Amino acid sequence: HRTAPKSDNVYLKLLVKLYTFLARRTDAPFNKVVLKALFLSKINRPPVSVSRIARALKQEGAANKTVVVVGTVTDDARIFEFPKTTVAALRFTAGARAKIVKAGGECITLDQLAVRAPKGQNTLILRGPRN
Template sequence: MAKIEMKGIINKSRTKFVSRNVYHQSLINLYTRISKHTTNATVQRIAARLRMSNNARHPVNLRKIAEENEKNPESIHVIVAKVLDDETLFVIPKMRISCLQISNSAKAKIEKFGGEVYTLDQIFEISEKLENVNLIKGDMTARKCYKYFGACGIPGSKTYPKSANKGKNREKRLNK
């Protein structure tokens, strides 16, 4: 049978992750290469999260990591995003973190209380089989643009109206 050619159909979806950050690109290459040759679910999850867009990799607060550390204190917490400091936390428990990026104040606070901070490529030096690893993800709806998604006029809806005119008699958010 002859194969029929489909003309005019172009696949415009992105097939390869594009990043100007050389370190991020090398991490993606490392984890995708490892995930092809292993059946470990955590490696495949980390590789998938590394390939996510910047909007999908939400930053994680130090308070959320401290709450997760209370549930399982012996595990290594892996965050495929940026870790930010919480100024309301004065004392944090001892924890081990492996993350993509970390703020200077958060790193100083973790190391002050006896914790350890690793990069994502150092995680194989800590635990070779990736046992006792806890993946932590940031809140998806934390960004301000999520407040505008949905219908704003429905009773009980907490969404903000998308109005360009911010005058006196224009559309405003109902505080109910």
């Protein structure tokens, strides 16, 4: 059982501050995923490629979905094509950030996300490849 984050970054403690609140007051178990997820260590917040985002929206009916990654979005040069999709994360590498702006969609923070999706309506949570 993991309790509170081992991080020192005070902007991250501000997120938890919100999500520990939204966990217990909303009772949509979306929140109880993210809030547990925030705490995770830096070898277990593996970085999500903008490629692994593009794969995840090929998934059927997911044309209108705010994909969320508690970790970081990384830029990829391999893929030309990218959907107009709203993407929330902790870190957007300058590269990636751009790769999403030019494609039309928004790159958004977990608290932007917490507002737009309080209970977490119509979301998709991805994970970076642990092994």
